[PDB]
Design a binder for this molecule. Sequence first.
Ligand SMILES: C[C@@H]1O[C@H](OP(=O)(O)OP(=O)(O)OC[C@H]2O[C@@H](n3ccc(=O)[nH]c3=O)[C@H](O)[C@@H]2O)[C@H](O)[C@H](O)[C@H]1O
Lengths: 294, 25
Amino acid sequence: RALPGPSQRQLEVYDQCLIGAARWPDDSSKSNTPENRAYCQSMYNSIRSAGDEISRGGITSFEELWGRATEWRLSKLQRGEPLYSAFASERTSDTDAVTPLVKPYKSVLARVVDHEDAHDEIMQDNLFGDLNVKVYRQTAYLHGNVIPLNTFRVATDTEYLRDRVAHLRTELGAKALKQHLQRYNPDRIDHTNASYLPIIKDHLNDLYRQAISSDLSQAELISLIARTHWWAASAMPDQRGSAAKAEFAARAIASAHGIELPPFRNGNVSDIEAMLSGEEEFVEKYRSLLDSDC
Amino acid sequence: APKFGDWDENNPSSADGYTHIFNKV
Ligand SMILES: C[C@@H]1O[C@H](OP(=O)(O)OP(=O)(O)OC[C@H]2O[C@@H](n3ccc(=O)[nH]c3=O)[C@H](O)[C@@H]2O)[C@H](O)[C@H](O)[C@H]1O
């Protein structure tokens, strides 16, 4: 059944230029720039065209949708082939994603440390040895079965470290210490094992199919949108760009039904808000993550 | 004690903050 399609009433432009922003609390400056506001407004446009086609039956699978997001994002890359290939390629089962918690991901470190669901564990490291780490272990539940996802760790014996790290550098050379930190920095996100991605993809086509219904109340539909956005962003299915892509999909599904969601709230980097939360936590909080203030 | 992650000051070997991809050991 065809759907109303994108709204005619459209976010004021101050908002459209925030669509997709990474409005880090600790440096919203980058949200304020000309090039970005260009990037975001581009996104807001390719979303809506995609919405147009969802509402008509042109996008059938969440995989075809994700193609529409991927396609868009690359067209915004002025970088080169080693960078074009990552944003274009699905993460595969013979590899492990990692994100060092450096900058701009320095705000996160508090979010893990004061997280109510945070553990206190030990990270056994061949160079620093044994370390205290506050740990969050995002998990998802599906068909009943538990899925582990991303794993936030923050080393806390911070004085040892700066002392230890300086130690280690002169021996192995910066060359071989950076090697370790690229893969074993004490503070780091260890992402959803790529092996889960086959099934997480079926579940996301199931989820998309339902939300392109025509009978859905305003509450459900959103509850569907928040989920999709949660599952994509948290599985991080592509080597690069998953963050944008996820938000692209979600917002395209919203405009299909004629909804015109706003930019997320400042300091609410949506992918990370979803990585540090369970499914139903995030479904509930979704509405307030959006700057729905007049 | 330093801030969390501020143990990694002025190190030339400080990681680059973005998603990396390695071979499964
Ligand atoms: C994030 C961390 O790194 C990866 O992101 P990646 O490095 O591939 O870059 P984006 O996801 O496109 O960028 C991250 C976010 O910044 C937005 N953006 C980017 C460039 C720009 O010029 N203007 C913008 O507004 C963009 O919309 C996206 O939502 C993973 O995805 C994962 O979510 C997490 O580990």
